[PDB]
Coordinates of C-alpha atoms and ligand atoms in Angstrom, one line a residue:
Chain A
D3 CA -59.5 31.0 9.1
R4 CA -59.2 27.9 10.4
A5 CA -58.7 25.9 7.1
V6 CA -56.0 28.6 6.4
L7 CA -54.1 26.9 9.5
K8 CA -54.8 23.1 8.3
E9 CA -52.3 24.4 5.5
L10 CA -49.7 25.5 7.6
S11 CA -50.3 22.7 10.2
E12 CA -50.0 20.0 7.6
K13 CA -47.0 21.8 5.7
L14 CA -44.9 22.2 9.2
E15 CA -45.5 18.7 9.8
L16 CA -44.4 17.7 6.2
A17 CA -41.1 19.8 6.4
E18 CA -40.3 18.6 9.9
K19 CA -40.5 15.3 8.7
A20 CA -38.5 16.0 5.6
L21 CA -35.8 17.5 8.0
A22 CA -35.6 14.1 9.8
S23 CA -35.2 12.2 6.7
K24 CA -32.7 14.4 5.2
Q25 CA -30.7 14.1 8.8
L26 CA -30.5 10.6 8.7
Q27 CA -29.1 10.4 4.9
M28 CA -26.7 12.9 6.3
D29 CA -25.8 10.7 9.2
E30 CA -25.2 7.7 7.1
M31 CA -22.7 9.8 4.4
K32 CA -21.1 11.2 7.6
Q33 CA -20.7 7.6 8.4
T34 CA -19.3 6.6 4.8
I35 CA -17.1 9.3 5.1
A36 CA -15.4 8.3 7.9
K37 CA -15.1 4.8 7.1
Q38 CA -13.8 5.6 3.6
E39 CA -11.0 7.9 5.7
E40 CA -10.2 4.8 7.3
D41 CA -9.7 2.9 4.5
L42 CA -7.2 5.7 3.1
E43 CA -5.2 5.2 6.2
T44 CA -4.4 1.9 4.4
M45 CA -2.8 3.7 1.2
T46 CA 0.3 5.0 3.3
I47 CA 1.1 1.5 4.1
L48 CA 0.7 0.1 0.5
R49 CA 2.9 2.7 -0.8
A50 CA 5.5 1.8 1.9
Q51 CA 5.1 -1.8 1.0
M52 CA 5.6 -1.2 -2.8
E53 CA 8.5 0.9 -2.3
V54 CA 10.1 -2.4 -0.1
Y55 CA 9.2 -4.7 -3.0
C56 CA 10.8 -2.2 -5.5
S57 CA 14.0 -2.1 -3.5
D58 CA 14.0 -5.8 -3.4
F59 CA 13.9 -6.1 -7.1
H60 CA 17.1 -3.9 -7.5
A61 CA 18.7 -5.7 -4.7
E62 CA 18.3 -9.1 -6.4
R63 CA 19.1 -7.5 -9.8
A64 CA 22.2 -6.5 -8.3
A65 CA 22.7 -10.1 -7.0
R66 CA 22.1 -11.4 -10.8
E67 CA 24.8 -9.0 -11.9
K68 CA 27.2 -10.0 -9.5
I69 CA 27.0 -13.7 -10.3
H70 CA 26.9 -13.3 -14.0
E71 CA 30.2 -12.0 -13.7
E72 CA 31.5 -14.7 -11.7
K73 CA 30.3 -17.4 -14.2
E74 CA 31.9 -15.0 -16.8
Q75 CA 35.0 -15.3 -15.2
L76 CA 34.7 -19.2 -15.0
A77 CA 33.7 -19.0 -18.6
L78 CA 37.0 -17.2 -19.4
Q79 CA 39.2 -19.4 -17.2
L80 CA 37.6 -22.5 -19.3
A81 CA 38.2 -20.7 -22.6
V82 CA 41.8 -20.1 -21.9
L83 CA 42.3 -23.8 -20.5
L84 CA 40.9 -25.4 -23.6
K85 CA 42.5 -23.1 -26.2
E86 CA 45.7 -24.1 -24.7
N87 CA 45.2 -27.7 -24.1
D88 CA 43.8 -27.6 -27.9
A89 CA 47.1 -26.5 -29.2
Chain B
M1 CA 3.2 -0.4 27.9
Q2 CA 1.6 -2.5 25.6
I3 CA 1.4 -2.0 21.7
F4 CA -0.1 -3.4 18.6
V5 CA 1.6 -4.3 15.3
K6 CA -0.7 -4.5 12.5
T7 CA 0.1 -6.6 9.4
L8 CA -1.2 -5.5 5.7
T9 CA -3.1 -8.9 5.9
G10 CA -5.3 -8.2 9.0
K11 CA -3.1 -10.1 11.6
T12 CA -2.6 -7.8 14.8
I13 CA 0.3 -8.7 17.3
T14 CA 0.3 -7.2 20.8
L15 CA 3.8 -6.7 22.4
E16 CA 5.1 -5.7 26.0
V17 CA 7.2 -2.9 25.3
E18 CA 8.4 0.3 27.6
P19 CA 9.5 3.7 26.2
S20 CA 13.2 3.3 26.4
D21 CA 13.1 -0.1 23.8
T22 CA 14.7 1.0 20.3
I23 CA 13.0 -0.3 17.1
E24 CA 15.7 -3.2 17.1
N25 CA 14.5 -4.3 20.0
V26 CA 10.8 -4.3 18.9
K27 CA 11.7 -6.1 15.7
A28 CA 13.6 -8.6 17.8
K29 CA 10.3 -9.2 20.0
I30 CA 8.4 -9.4 16.9
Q31 CA 10.6 -12.3 15.5
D32 CA 10.2 -14.0 19.1
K33 CA 6.5 -14.0 18.7
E34 CA 6.3 -14.7 15.2
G35 CA 9.3 -15.8 13.7
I36 CA 10.0 -13.3 11.0
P37 CA 13.7 -12.3 10.7
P38 CA 14.3 -8.8 11.8
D39 CA 16.0 -8.0 8.4
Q40 CA 12.6 -9.0 6.6
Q41 CA 10.5 -6.8 8.6
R42 CA 10.0 -2.7 8.2
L43 CA 7.9 -1.0 10.6
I44 CA 5.6 2.3 10.1
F45 CA 3.8 4.5 12.4
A46 CA 2.0 7.7 11.6
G47 CA 3.2 7.0 7.9
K48 CA 6.8 7.2 9.2
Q49 CA 9.2 4.5 8.6
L50 CA 10.8 3.6 11.9
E51 CA 14.6 3.2 11.7
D52 CA 16.8 0.9 13.7
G53 CA 18.8 3.1 16.1
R54 CA 15.9 5.5 17.5
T55 CA 13.3 4.5 20.3
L56 CA 9.7 4.6 20.9
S57 CA 10.1 7.7 22.8
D58 CA 11.7 9.2 20.0
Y59 CA 8.9 8.6 17.9
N60 CA 6.3 9.6 20.8
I61 CA 5.1 5.8 20.6
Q62 CA 2.5 5.7 23.6
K63 CA 0.4 3.2 25.2
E64 CA -1.9 0.8 23.3
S65 CA -0.3 2.7 20.0
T66 CA -0.8 0.8 17.0
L67 CA 2.4 0.3 14.7
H68 CA 1.9 -1.3 10.9
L69 CA 4.2 -3.8 9.8
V70 CA 5.4 -4.6 6.0
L71 CA 7.3 -7.6 4.9
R72 CA 10.3 -7.7 2.7
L73 CA 10.7 -10.5 -0.1
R74 CA 14.1 -10.9 0.6
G75 CA 16.4 -10.5 3.7
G76 CA 20.2 -9.6 3.8
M77 CA 21.5 -13.3 3.3
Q78 CA 20.6 -15.9 0.9
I79 CA 22.4 -19.3 0.3
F80 CA 21.8 -22.0 -2.8
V81 CA 21.1 -25.6 -2.5
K82 CA 20.9 -27.9 -5.2
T83 CA 18.2 -30.4 -5.3
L84 CA 18.2 -34.2 -6.7
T85 CA 17.3 -32.8 -9.8
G86 CA 20.1 -30.5 -10.3
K87 CA 17.9 -27.3 -10.2
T88 CA 18.8 -24.4 -7.7
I89 CA 16.5 -23.0 -5.3
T90 CA 17.0 -20.2 -3.0
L91 CA 16.7 -19.8 0.7
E92 CA 16.3 -16.8 2.9
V93 CA 18.6 -17.5 6.0
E94 CA 20.5 -15.9 9.0
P95 CA 23.9 -16.8 10.1
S96 CA 22.3 -17.9 13.3
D97 CA 19.9 -20.7 11.7
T98 CA 20.4 -24.1 12.5
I99 CA 20.6 -26.9 9.9
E100 CA 17.4 -28.4 11.5
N101 CA 15.9 -24.9 10.5
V102 CA 17.3 -24.9 7.1
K103 CA 15.9 -28.3 6.5
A104 CA 12.6 -27.2 7.4
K105 CA 12.7 -24.4 5.0
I106 CA 13.7 -26.9 2.0
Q107 CA 10.6 -28.7 3.0
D108 CA 8.5 -25.9 2.4
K109 CA 10.3 -25.8 -1.1
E110 CA 10.4 -29.6 -1.9
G111 CA 8.0 -31.3 0.6
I112 CA 11.0 -33.4 1.6
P113 CA 10.8 -34.1 5.5
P114 CA 13.7 -33.0 7.3
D115 CA 14.5 -36.6 8.8
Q116 CA 14.9 -37.7 5.3
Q117 CA 17.3 -34.8 4.1
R118 CA 21.3 -34.8 4.5
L119 CA 23.0 -31.6 3.7
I120 CA 26.4 -31.6 2.5
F121 CA 28.7 -28.3 2.4
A122 CA 32.3 -28.5 1.2
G123 CA 32.5 -32.4 1.5
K124 CA 31.1 -32.3 4.9
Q125 CA 27.7 -33.2 6.0
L126 CA 26.0 -30.9 8.6
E127 CA 24.7 -32.0 11.8
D128 CA 21.0 -30.5 13.1
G129 CA 22.2 -28.8 16.2
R130 CA 24.8 -26.4 14.8
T131 CA 24.3 -22.8 13.0
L132 CA 25.6 -21.8 9.4
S133 CA 28.0 -19.7 11.3
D134 CA 29.6 -22.8 13.0
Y135 CA 30.2 -23.9 9.6
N136 CA 31.0 -20.8 8.3
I137 CA 28.5 -20.6 5.6
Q138 CA 28.1 -17.3 4.0
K139 CA 26.1 -15.5 1.3
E140 CA 25.6 -17.4 -1.9
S141 CA 27.0 -20.4 -0.5
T142 CA 25.8 -23.6 -2.2
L143 CA 24.8 -26.8 -0.4
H144 CA 24.0 -30.3 -1.6
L145 CA 20.9 -32.4 -0.7
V146 CA 20.8 -36.0 -0.4
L147 CA 18.1 -38.3 0.3
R148 CA 17.5 -41.2 3.2
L149 CA 14.9 -43.5 4.1
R150 CA 13.7 -43.1 7.7
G151 CA 10.5 -42.7 9.2
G152 CA 7.9 -41.8 6.2
Chain C
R4 CA -46.8 27.6 -6.6
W5 CA -43.1 27.3 -6.7
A6 CA -40.4 26.1 -9.3
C7 CA -37.4 24.2 -8.2
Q8 CA -34.2 26.3 -8.8
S9 CA -32.2 23.0 -10.0
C10 CA -34.4 20.9 -11.9
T11 CA -36.6 23.9 -12.8
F12 CA -39.8 21.6 -12.2
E13 CA -43.0 23.7 -10.7
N14 CA -44.2 22.6 -7.6
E15 CA -47.3 22.9 -5.7
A16 CA -47.8 25.1 -2.5
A17 CA -47.7 22.4 -0.2
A18 CA -44.6 21.0 -1.6
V19 CA -41.5 21.7 0.6
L20 CA -39.3 19.2 -1.4
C21 CA -39.1 19.2 -4.8
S22 CA -41.4 16.6 -6.6
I23 CA -38.6 15.5 -8.7
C24 CA -35.2 15.8 -7.3
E25 CA -36.5 16.0 -3.9
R26 CA -34.2 19.5 -2.9
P27 CA -35.8 21.9 -0.5
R28 CA -37.2 24.7 -2.4
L29 CA -34.6 27.4 -1.0
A30 CA -31.8 25.5 -2.2
Chain D
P2 CA -55.5 34.5 19.1
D3 CA -55.4 33.5 15.5
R4 CA -53.4 36.5 14.4
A5 CA -50.5 35.6 16.8
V6 CA -50.7 31.8 16.5
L7 CA -50.7 32.4 12.6
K8 CA -47.8 34.7 12.8
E9 CA -46.0 32.2 14.8
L10 CA -46.6 29.3 12.8
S11 CA -45.7 31.1 9.7
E12 CA -42.3 32.2 11.0
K13 CA -41.5 28.4 12.1
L14 CA -42.3 27.2 8.5
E15 CA -39.5 29.9 7.4
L16 CA -37.2 28.6 9.9
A17 CA -37.7 25.0 9.0
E18 CA -37.5 25.6 5.1
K19 CA -34.4 27.7 5.8
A20 CA -32.9 24.6 7.5
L21 CA -33.6 22.3 5.1
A22 CA -32.0 24.4 2.6
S23 CA -28.9 24.6 5.2
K24 CA -29.0 20.8 5.8
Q25 CA -29.4 20.2 1.9
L26 CA -26.2 22.6 1.4
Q27 CA -24.4 20.5 3.9
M28 CA -25.1 17.3 2.4
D29 CA -24.0 18.7 -1.0
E30 CA -20.5 19.6 0.4
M31 CA -20.3 15.9 1.9
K32 CA -21.2 14.4 -1.3
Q33 CA -18.4 16.1 -2.8
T34 CA -15.8 14.9 -0.5
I35 CA -17.1 11.4 -0.8
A36 CA -16.3 11.7 -4.6
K37 CA -13.1 12.9 -3.7
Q38 CA -12.2 10.1 -1.7
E39 CA -13.7 7.4 -4.1
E40 CA -11.0 8.9 -6.7
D41 CA -8.4 8.5 -4.0
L42 CA -9.7 4.8 -3.4
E43 CA -9.2 4.2 -7.1
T44 CA -5.5 4.8 -6.8
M45 CA -5.3 2.3 -4.1
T46 CA -6.8 -0.6 -6.3
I47 CA -4.0 0.2 -8.8
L48 CA -1.5 0.6 -6.0
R49 CA -2.3 -3.0 -4.8
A50 CA -2.3 -4.2 -8.5
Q51 CA 1.1 -2.4 -9.0
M52 CA 2.9 -4.0 -5.8
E53 CA 1.6 -7.2 -6.9
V54 CA 3.2 -6.7 -10.2
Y55 CA 6.5 -5.9 -8.5
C56 CA 6.7 -9.2 -6.8
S57 CA 6.1 -11.1 -10.1
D58 CA 9.3 -9.0 -11.4
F59 CA 11.3 -9.8 -8.3
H60 CA 10.7 -13.7 -8.9
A61 CA 11.7 -13.4 -12.3
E62 CA 14.7 -12.1 -11.3
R63 CA 15.2 -14.5 -8.6
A64 CA 14.7 -17.4 -11.5
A65 CA 17.1 -15.5 -13.5
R66 CA 19.8 -15.5 -10.9
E67 CA 19.3 -19.0 -10.0
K68 CA 19.7 -20.1 -13.4
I69 CA 23.0 -18.4 -13.8
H70 CA 24.0 -20.2 -10.5
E71 CA 23.4 -23.6 -12.1
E72 CA 25.4 -22.6 -15.3
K73 CA 28.3 -21.3 -13.2
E74 CA 28.1 -24.5 -11.1
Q75 CA 28.2 -26.4 -14.4
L76 CA 31.5 -24.6 -15.5
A77 CA 33.2 -24.8 -12.1
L78 CA 32.5 -28.8 -12.2
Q79 CA 33.9 -28.8 -16.1
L80 CA 36.9 -26.8 -15.1
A81 CA 37.5 -29.0 -12.1
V82 CA 37.1 -32.0 -14.4
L83 CA 39.1 -30.7 -17.0
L84 CA 42.0 -30.0 -14.6
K85 CA 42.1 -33.5 -13.3
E86 CA 42.4 -34.6 -17.0
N87 CA 45.1 -32.1 -17.7
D88 CA 47.0 -33.5 -14.8
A89 CA 46.8 -37.0 -16.6
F90 CA 48.9 -35.5 -19.3
Chain E
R4 CA -41.1 23.3 25.5
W5 CA -39.7 20.2 23.8
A6 CA -36.6 18.3 24.5
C7 CA -34.2 17.0 21.8
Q8 CA -34.1 12.9 21.5
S9 CA -30.6 13.2 20.9
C10 CA -28.6 15.3 23.8
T11 CA -31.8 15.2 26.0
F12 CA -31.3 19.0 25.8
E13 CA -34.5 21.2 25.8
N14 CA -35.2 23.5 22.9
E15 CA -37.7 26.4 22.7
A16 CA -41.2 25.5 21.2
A17 CA -40.3 27.6 18.2
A18 CA -37.0 25.9 17.9
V19 CA -37.1 23.8 14.8
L20 CA -33.2 22.4 15.1
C21 CA -31.8 21.7 18.5
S22 CA -29.8 25.1 19.5
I23 CA -26.7 22.6 20.7
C24 CA -26.1 20.0 17.9
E25 CA -28.3 21.3 15.3
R26 CA -30.5 18.1 14.9
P27 CA -34.3 18.4 13.8
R28 CA -36.4 17.8 16.6
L29 CA -37.7 14.7 15.0
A30 CA -34.5 13.2 14.8
Chain F
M1 CA -14.2 4.9 -29.8
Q2 CA -12.5 6.5 -27.1
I3 CA -10.9 5.0 -23.9
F4 CA -9.0 6.3 -20.9
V5 CA -6.1 4.4 -19.3
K6 CA -5.0 5.6 -15.7
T7 CA -1.5 5.3 -14.2
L8 CA -0.5 5.1 -10.6
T9 CA 1.0 8.5 -10.8
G10 CA -2.2 10.3 -11.6
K11 CA -1.5 10.8 -15.5
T12 CA -4.6 9.7 -17.6
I13 CA -4.0 9.0 -21.1
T14 CA -6.8 9.0 -23.7
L15 CA -6.6 6.6 -26.6
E16 CA -8.9 6.8 -29.9
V17 CA -9.3 3.0 -30.3
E18 CA -12.1 0.5 -31.8
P19 CA -13.5 -2.8 -30.3
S20 CA -12.1 -5.1 -32.5
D21 CA -8.4 -4.0 -31.6
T22 CA -6.2 -6.2 -29.7
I23 CA -4.6 -5.7 -26.5
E24 CA -1.1 -5.6 -28.4
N25 CA -2.4 -2.8 -30.4
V26 CA -3.8 -1.0 -27.4
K27 CA -0.1 -1.3 -25.7
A28 CA 1.3 -0.3 -29.0
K29 CA -0.6 2.9 -28.9
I30 CA 0.4 3.5 -25.1
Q31 CA 3.8 3.0 -26.2
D32 CA 3.6 5.7 -29.1
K33 CA 1.9 7.9 -26.5
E34 CA 4.2 7.4 -23.6
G35 CA 7.3 5.6 -24.8
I36 CA 6.9 2.6 -22.3
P37 CA 7.4 -0.7 -24.1
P38 CA 4.4 -3.4 -24.1
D39 CA 6.3 -6.0 -22.3
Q40 CA 6.6 -3.5 -19.7
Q41 CA 3.1 -2.5 -19.2
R42 CA -0.1 -4.7 -17.8
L43 CA -3.7 -3.6 -18.3
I44 CA -6.3 -4.1 -16.4
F45 CA -10.3 -3.5 -16.5
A46 CA -13.2 -4.0 -13.9
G47 CA -10.4 -6.0 -12.0
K48 CA -9.4 -8.5 -14.8
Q49 CA -6.2 -8.4 -16.3
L50 CA -6.2 -7.9 -20.1
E51 CA -4.3 -10.6 -22.0
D52 CA -2.6 -10.0 -25.4
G53 CA -4.8 -12.3 -27.7
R54 CA -8.2 -10.8 -27.0
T55 CA -9.8 -7.6 -28.1
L56 CA -11.8 -4.8 -26.3
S57 CA -14.9 -6.4 -27.4
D58 CA -13.5 -9.8 -25.5
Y59 CA -13.6 -7.8 -22.2
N60 CA -16.6 -5.6 -23.0
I61 CA -14.8 -2.2 -23.2
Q62 CA -16.9 0.3 -24.4
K63 CA -16.8 4.0 -25.4
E64 CA -15.5 6.2 -22.3
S65 CA -14.2 3.5 -20.3
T66 CA -11.0 3.7 -17.9
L67 CA -8.4 0.9 -17.9
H68 CA -5.8 0.6 -15.3
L69 CA -2.2 0.7 -16.3
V70 CA 0.4 -0.9 -14.1
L71 CA 4.1 -0.5 -14.9
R72 CA 6.8 -3.3 -14.7
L73 CA 10.2 -2.7 -13.2
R74 CA 11.8 -5.0 -15.8
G75 CA 10.9 -6.4 -19.4
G76 CA 11.5 -9.5 -21.3
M77 CA 15.0 -8.9 -22.7
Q78 CA 18.0 -7.6 -20.9
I79 CA 21.6 -7.2 -21.6
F80 CA 24.6 -6.6 -19.7
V81 CA 27.5 -4.0 -20.0
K82 CA 30.5 -4.6 -18.6
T83 CA 33.2 -1.7 -18.0
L84 CA 36.8 -2.1 -17.8
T85 CA 36.2 -1.1 -14.1
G86 CA 34.5 -4.5 -13.3
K87 CA 31.1 -2.8 -13.1
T88 CA 28.5 -4.6 -14.6
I89 CA 25.1 -2.9 -15.6
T90 CA 21.8 -4.3 -16.9
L91 CA 19.8 -2.7 -19.6
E92 CA 16.1 -3.4 -20.7
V93 CA 16.3 -3.5 -24.4
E94 CA 14.2 -4.7 -27.4
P95 CA 15.7 -6.2 -30.3
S96 CA 14.5 -3.4 -32.4
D97 CA 16.5 -1.1 -30.3
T98 CA 19.4 1.0 -32.0
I99 CA 23.0 1.1 -30.8
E100 CA 22.2 5.1 -30.2
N101 CA 19.1 4.1 -28.3
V102 CA 21.4 1.6 -26.3
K103 CA 23.9 4.3 -25.5
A104 CA 21.2 6.7 -24.6
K105 CA 20.4 4.2 -21.8
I106 CA 24.0 3.7 -20.7
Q107 CA 23.9 7.6 -20.4
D108 CA 20.8 7.5 -18.6
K109 CA 22.4 5.2 -15.9
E110 CA 26.0 6.2 -15.8
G111 CA 25.9 9.9 -17.2
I112 CA 29.0 9.3 -20.0
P113 CA 27.7 11.0 -23.1
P114 CA 27.1 8.7 -26.4
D115 CA 30.0 10.4 -28.3
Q116 CA 32.5 8.9 -25.6
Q117 CA 31.0 5.3 -25.9
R118 CA 32.6 2.5 -27.5
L119 CA 30.5 -0.6 -27.2
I120 CA 32.3 -3.8 -28.5
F121 CA 30.5 -7.1 -29.0
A122 CA 31.9 -10.4 -30.1
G123 CA 35.2 -8.9 -31.2
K124 CA 33.8 -6.3 -33.2
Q125 CA 33.0 -2.6 -32.5
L126 CA 29.0 -1.4 -32.8
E127 CA 28.0 1.1 -35.1
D128 CA 25.3 3.5 -34.1
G129 CA 22.8 3.1 -37.2
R130 CA 22.2 -0.6 -36.5
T131 CA 19.9 -2.4 -34.2
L132 CA 20.3 -5.2 -31.4
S133 CA 19.0 -7.8 -33.9
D134 CA 21.2 -6.7 -36.4
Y135 CA 24.4 -7.6 -34.3
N136 CA 22.8 -10.9 -33.3
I137 CA 22.7 -9.5 -29.7
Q138 CA 20.2 -11.5 -27.7
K139 CA 18.8 -12.1 -24.0
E140 CA 21.7 -11.9 -21.4
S141 CA 24.2 -10.9 -23.9
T142 CA 27.1 -9.1 -22.5
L143 CA 28.5 -5.9 -24.1
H144 CA 31.9 -4.1 -23.2
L145 CA 32.1 -0.3 -22.7
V146 CA 35.5 1.5 -23.1
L147 CA 35.6 5.2 -23.2
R148 CA 37.4 7.3 -25.6
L149 CA 41.0 8.5 -25.2
Chain G
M1 CA -18.3 10.9 43.9
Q2 CA -18.8 9.6 40.7
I3 CA -20.8 10.9 37.5
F4 CA -21.2 9.7 34.1
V5 CA -21.0 12.0 30.9
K6 CA -22.9 10.4 27.8
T7 CA -21.5 10.9 24.4
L8 CA -23.8 11.0 21.4
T9 CA -21.6 8.3 19.8
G10 CA -23.0 5.9 22.4
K11 CA -20.0 5.9 24.7
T12 CA -20.4 6.5 28.6
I13 CA -17.5 7.8 30.4
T14 CA -17.5 7.6 34.3
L15 CA -16.0 10.8 36.0
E16 CA -14.8 10.9 39.6
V17 CA -15.3 14.7 40.9
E18 CA -16.5 16.5 43.9
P19 CA -19.5 19.2 43.9
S20 CA -17.2 21.8 44.5
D21 CA -15.3 21.0 41.1
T22 CA -16.0 23.9 38.7
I23 CA -17.4 23.0 35.1
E24 CA -14.1 23.9 33.9
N25 CA -12.4 21.4 36.1
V26 CA -14.7 18.6 34.5
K27 CA -14.2 19.7 31.1
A28 CA -10.3 19.4 31.6
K29 CA -11.1 16.2 33.4
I30 CA -12.8 15.0 30.0
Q31 CA -10.1 16.2 27.8
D32 CA -7.4 14.3 30.1
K33 CA -9.0 10.8 29.6
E34 CA -10.7 11.1 26.2
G35 CA -8.9 13.8 24.3
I36 CA -11.5 16.1 23.3
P37 CA -10.5 19.7 23.7
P38 CA -12.5 21.7 26.1
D39 CA -13.6 24.3 23.4
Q40 CA -15.7 21.9 21.6
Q41 CA -17.2 20.4 24.6
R42 CA -20.7 21.5 25.8
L43 CA -22.3 20.0 29.1
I44 CA -26.0 19.4 29.3
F45 CA -28.1 18.2 32.4
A46 CA -31.7 18.8 33.2
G47 CA -32.0 20.9 30.0
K48 CA -29.1 23.4 31.0
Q49 CA -26.1 24.4 29.5
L50 CA -23.4 24.3 32.3
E51 CA -21.5 27.5 32.9
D52 CA -17.7 27.0 33.2
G53 CA -17.5 29.4 36.1
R54 CA -20.3 27.7 37.9
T55 CA -20.0 24.4 40.2
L56 CA -21.6 21.3 40.1
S57 CA -23.4 22.0 43.2
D58 CA -24.4 25.2 41.4
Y59 CA -26.7 23.0 39.3
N60 CA -27.5 20.3 42.4
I61 CA -25.3 17.6 40.5
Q62 CA -25.3 14.7 42.9
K63 CA -23.6 11.3 42.8
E64 CA -24.5 8.8 39.9
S65 CA -25.9 11.8 37.6
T66 CA -25.7 11.6 34.1
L67 CA -24.6 14.8 31.8
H68 CA -24.9 15.0 27.9
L69 CA -21.7 15.8 26.2
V70 CA -22.2 17.6 22.6
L71 CA -19.4 18.4 20.3
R72 CA -19.7 21.8 18.5
Ligands
LIG1 ZN1 -36.2 20.0 -8.3
LIG2 ZN1 -29.4 18.6 21.0

């Protein structure tokens, strides 16, 4: 029947068009997958940076503790001198 | 060989290097092109931090490779300088930095041009040509800043 | 003619994708 | 021949609809991996936010250290001054 | 019968996806 | 209402909260669940830092929202503990912290058990039941640690 | 002589070969200058998948010709 093949003809074109549409969408998601993955490369660099910022904080804390003891010594040397002179 | 160093803030440096060069050298080269002290820079490749002793070949760094560079907030040596208000400010330096180099840093912090700064260390005024090591300035040393009236 | 295997909507014979979620009949 | 031509077209429709299913399954997999990546990119935003706080902490510690330096220089002067005076007797 | 618009490879008339890259004929 | 706060280390905390609650209360709740002092945590939502004065409603945080929580390396108040060996160490503390809490932090850092610590502050030895505020311990105060014999 | 290999990425690679070169020799050359392993390479010209064992003169591949590289 000619009409029965009008059915199959129209559907095959519709299905082939849909395949085209779905593949374009697929290409777009392949594009974003790759782009995102490139951005995930940055994360290893961010972590390493955060670790240097962390070490730097601890280095400065260590400096602060050192200078704190130096000041405490001088504050002690002062107290001795004033106590003796304040006899 | 030619390699690229990319920073976290976009900028991309391109260096001329050879396989036998050690990481200490490439950091030195980075200082020449961009002024960053080696003790403030950390280099990464393939997610691995690069250690100073070893070479590019030991890491299989090849032509047109791209390293990544992260920057420390501090270095190995700091000095304190006392400002005209009495407040203390801290500078990151290296023993090789010149007094003019230091004055440039004080300007970055206090807006006072180098020609109007006089730096005093242990009663002596420092001259621009000399290095900190020449005056034997060391970590946590204190310098005193005094003003003058030349130029603008 | 066919019912979508995901959103359960029933579609016409000429439909290749679901009229609602637009998924193929055999998915 | 209508018999062969309609057998042929029929089998192609089935192949096309099978491919449609196959390609959609592929899309389903990539949508899943897209979502996992998005979660990982959420962690990156926090990683940035974290490190910016670590800088704030470093500068607070620097500020603390500078203050002790100003205090220590004060004591060193009060001490030096006091020593001169004590040599006045 | 038809040649793919991607690889320029020729596929059979009955082929719906390209036999090589597995792309639709109309893509 | 129920909200989720995400930390950098994967973990996802879930709090039961209401719109009128202030950020200080939410930080308090985070402390109850996780032990982190409020002054050590920063909360972010939609890329906006959450400030203590305002409420969840002031930031339009609603049901099933996801906050982000970043952790400071330091807090608001530190004290120093000095050993007879010359070592100075810094503790992050709160004025409400008990002497037992402080000795526990010293153990977390120097491995010497609390039963062997004597903490001396301004000529007086400190007793385990009281808080730092009870003894007038303040920012950058110095405590001295001596071991038992 | 020179030939052009056209990838689906829009990148066109140039190769210097001889018509006596086996199809394995050219896929090795493609790997050598762009890294793609040979087992993933599928070369097409004139709508023919080219046989490893055959040569370029087998398919009458003359100078300035363009092949098509598809990855599987
Ligand atoms: Zn459906
Ligand atoms: Zn193809």
